[PDB]
Amino acid sequence: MVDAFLGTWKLVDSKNFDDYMKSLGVGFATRQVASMTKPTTIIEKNGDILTLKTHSTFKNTEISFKLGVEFDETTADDRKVKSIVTLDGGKLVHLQKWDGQETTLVRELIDGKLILTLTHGTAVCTRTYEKEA
Ligand SMILES: CCCCCCCCCCCCCCCCCCCCCCC(=O)O
Numbered sequence: 789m790v791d792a793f794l795g796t797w798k799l800v801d802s803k804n805f806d807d808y809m810k811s812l813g814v815g816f817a818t819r820q821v822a823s824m825t826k827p828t829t830i831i832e833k834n835g836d837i838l839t840l841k842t843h844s845t846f847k848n849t850e851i852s853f854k855l856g857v858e859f860d861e862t863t864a865d866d867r868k869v870k871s872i873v874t875l876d877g878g879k880l881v882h883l884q885k886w887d888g889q890e891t892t893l894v895r896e897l898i899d900g901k902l903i904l905t906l907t908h909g910t911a912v913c914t915r916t917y918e919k920e921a
Pocket residue numbers: 799809814818822825827829842843844846847848849863864865904915
């Protein structure tokens with residue numbers, strides 16, 4: 789179900805990430821470093837448990853979850869959120885909730901590339917990842 793998402797992915801295009809970070813209240817200095825960072829995202833599976841690592845020269849994160857089961861998460865920008873990840877239309881949809889706010893992180897495969905769409909408020913960011921061998 790999730791199997792074409794699995795592997796190591798490198799950031800190759802970003803659009804509107806500053807908009808997205810600013811909407812979340814990320815400070816200018818962090819937005820500045822993040823705008824020049826190219827993370828590696830690693831998505832692994834062990835049975836029903838997915839682990840999603842995001843590695844960079846600035847911030848690292850790691851989450852583990854079962855699809856369709858809520859989990860606590862502390863994001864790269866230090867939000868403490870209630871999260872759930874599911875497959876929807878073949879897309880991996882990650883919803884974060886905190887303080888009555890929501891953001892979605894939607895991953896879809898298009899021509900072998902991993903497109904991550906990040907929405908908060910009115911801000912919509914599109915970031916493109918290519919697989920590493
Ligand atoms: C989960 C990403 C964090 C690990 C590497 C981060 C590189 C820059 C963006 C994300 C975190 C650091 C800067 C603060 C903004 C974080 C906003 C939420 C997470 C965005 C993840 C973006 C991505 O996975 O490409």
